[PDB]
Amino acid sequence: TTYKLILNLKQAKEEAIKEAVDAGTAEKYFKLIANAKTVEGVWTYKDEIKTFTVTE
């Protein structure tokens, strides 16, 4: 399964993704790229293709 992440900061929009056999690997992995790229936003997840988002 593949997961996607929509990063929305003050002035920039980046997308994070990763292919794993679950979510725990996508969340922990996403959290590493998210926090490493930003430090503020609204954590959300879209039900359909497995995706999370963080809007600041």
Q: How far apart are CA 2 and CA 53, in angstroms?
A: 14
CATH number of the domain that residue 9 is part of: 3.10.20.10
**DSSP track, 19-49:** E-SSSHHHHHHHHHHHHHH-S--EEEEETTT
Angstrom distances, CA of residue 53 to CA of 4, 14, 34: 8, 10, 9
Location of structure tokens 């992440």:
5
Residues pairing with 17 in the sheet: 4
Domain extent, residue 28, equals 1-56
Q: How far apart are CA 45 and CA 52, in angstroms?
A: 4
**How many domains in the chain?**
1
3-class DSSP state for residue 10?
Answer: coil
